[PDB]
Enzyme design. Structure first.
Site, PDB file in Angstrom:
ATOM      1  N   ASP A 207       0.844  -1.191   0.000  1.00  0.00           N
ATOM      2  CA  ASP A 207       0.000   0.000   0.000  1.00  0.00           C
ATOM      3  C   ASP A 207       0.881   1.243   0.000  1.00  0.00           C
ATOM      4  O   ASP A 207       1.365   1.663   1.059  1.00  0.00           O
ATOM      5  CB  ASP A 207      -0.908  -0.006   1.219  1.00  0.00           C
ATOM      6  CG  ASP A 207      -1.818   1.195   1.283  1.00  0.00           C
ATOM      7  OD1 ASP A 207      -1.909   1.922   0.276  1.00  0.00           O
ATOM      8  OD2 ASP A 207      -2.411   1.425   2.362  1.00  0.00           O
TER       9      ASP A 207
ATOM     10  N   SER B  68      -0.628  15.694 -12.006  1.00  0.00           N
ATOM     11  CA  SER B  68      -0.886  15.338 -13.393  1.00  0.00           C
ATOM     12  C   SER B  68      -1.136  16.600 -14.207  1.00  0.00           C
ATOM     13  O   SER B  68      -1.663  17.595 -13.711  1.00  0.00           O
ATOM     14  CB  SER B  68      -2.112  14.414 -13.476  1.00  0.00           C
ATOM     15  OG  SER B  68      -2.474  14.153 -14.817  1.00  0.00           O
TER      16      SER B  68
END
Ligand SMILES: NC(=O)c1cc2ccccc2[nH]1
EC number: 3.4.23.22
Length: 330
Positions: A35, A199
């Site tokens: 994770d 992004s």
């Protein structure tokens, strides 16, 4: 040193991925959920409340000659999906794909919430975010990657998750046969403890690319892709019959649909998520309403590049003095 381990979807939907991890002496092999959105290595154990164990493999520290109680240390974690676990702490030898750390904090669960009990395939979590998020008190503990880093040939790990298929986590090296083209690296903020990056925009199907900054986290421990409501609405508007259902808890779409792809920007580069990766199947067994793999982050407080996005790429988690993230197509 290096390590290399295969990671395998837990079910036919790729809801999560498990990777075998050796703990203790002699080794006890548990299948952990790696994770990158948390920083605790915790396991089902011989100390876990018996009614909360249903099929998981447990770590028994009393059978490990290298286990030592970390005196006074406790841990307690609550995840974004509302699940939680807590317990005490041992140190022990932990190995992943041939890479061994001695003295790793292994957090032994005394209690786990129902969603963990109900998932017999996940024996614990191995956190790979930054150690500043580790919950051990009163002395915070380091992640497996942080402990291994100095010994690694290169201070990196990579995630190569499969679509309905096994993939790989590598530690200490970049497998240049595992991706196409070049790796595009992008800046990381560690201020929230996550692999947080920006992004450069998105496109829906064959549509034109929209240049817009989207700050989010690379999180292997989250199934879906969570993005701003404007972006998610633009995606699902291209799917006839798709709608947001408050009763279901997100966007659903007719199971008869063919989904468009979704592209996200990494600098000047582009990662394309095929439409099929966005299909999470019937909302309930036999339903013709299917659950979408792109969902709004509006109620979360952060955008999350979860498995839906990451499994479309070869992803480099670069733990150099100034961390960065790299993405390549594959
Ligand atoms: N103290 C907590 O309950 C807690 C810390 C943390 C770090 C990453 C993801 C979820 C988390 N919950």
């Amino acid at each position: 040193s290096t390590g290399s381990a295969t990671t395998t979807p837990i079910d036919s939907l790729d809801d999560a991925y498990i990777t075998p991890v050796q703990i203790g002496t002699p080794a006890q092999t548990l299948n952990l959920d790696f994770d990158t959105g948390s920083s605790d290595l915790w396991v089902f154990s011989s100390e876990t409340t018996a009614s909360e164990v249903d099929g998981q493999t447990i770590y028994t520290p009393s059978k490990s000659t290298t286990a030592k109680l970390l005196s006074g240390a406790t841990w307690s974690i609550s995840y974004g999906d509302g699940s939680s676990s807590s317990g005490d702490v041992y140190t022990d030898t932990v190995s992943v794909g041939g890479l061994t750390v001695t003295g790793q904090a292994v957090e032994s669960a005394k209690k786990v919430s129902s969603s963990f009990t109900e998932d017999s395939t996940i024996d614990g979590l191995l956190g790979l975010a930054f150690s500043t998020l580790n919950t051990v008190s009163p002395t915070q503990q380091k992640t497996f990657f942080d402990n291994a880093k100095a010994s690694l040939d290169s201070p990196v790990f990579t995630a190569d998750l499969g679509y309905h298929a096994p993939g790989t986590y590598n530690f200490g090296f970049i497998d240049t046969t595992a991706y196409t083209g070049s790796i595009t690296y992008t800046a990381v903020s560690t201020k929230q403890g996550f692999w947080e990056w920006t992004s450069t925009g998105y496109a829906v199907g064959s549509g034109t690319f929209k240049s817009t900054s989207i700050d989010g986290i690379a999180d292997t421990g989250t199934t879906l892709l969570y993005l701003p409501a404007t972006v998610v609405s633009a995606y699902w508007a291209q799917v006839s019959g798709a709608k947001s259902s408050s009763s279901v808890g997100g966007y659903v779409f007719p199971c008869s649909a063919t989904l468009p792809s979704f592209t996200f920007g990494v600098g000047s580069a582009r990662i394309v998520i095929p439409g099929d990766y966005i299909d999470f199947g019937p909302i309930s067994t036999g339903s013709s309403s299917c659950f979408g793999g792109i969902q709004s982050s509006a109620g979360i407080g952060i955008n999350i590049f979860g498995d839906v996005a990451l499994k479309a790429a070869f992803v480099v988690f670069n733990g150099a003095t100034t961390p960065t993230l790299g993405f390549a197509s594959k």
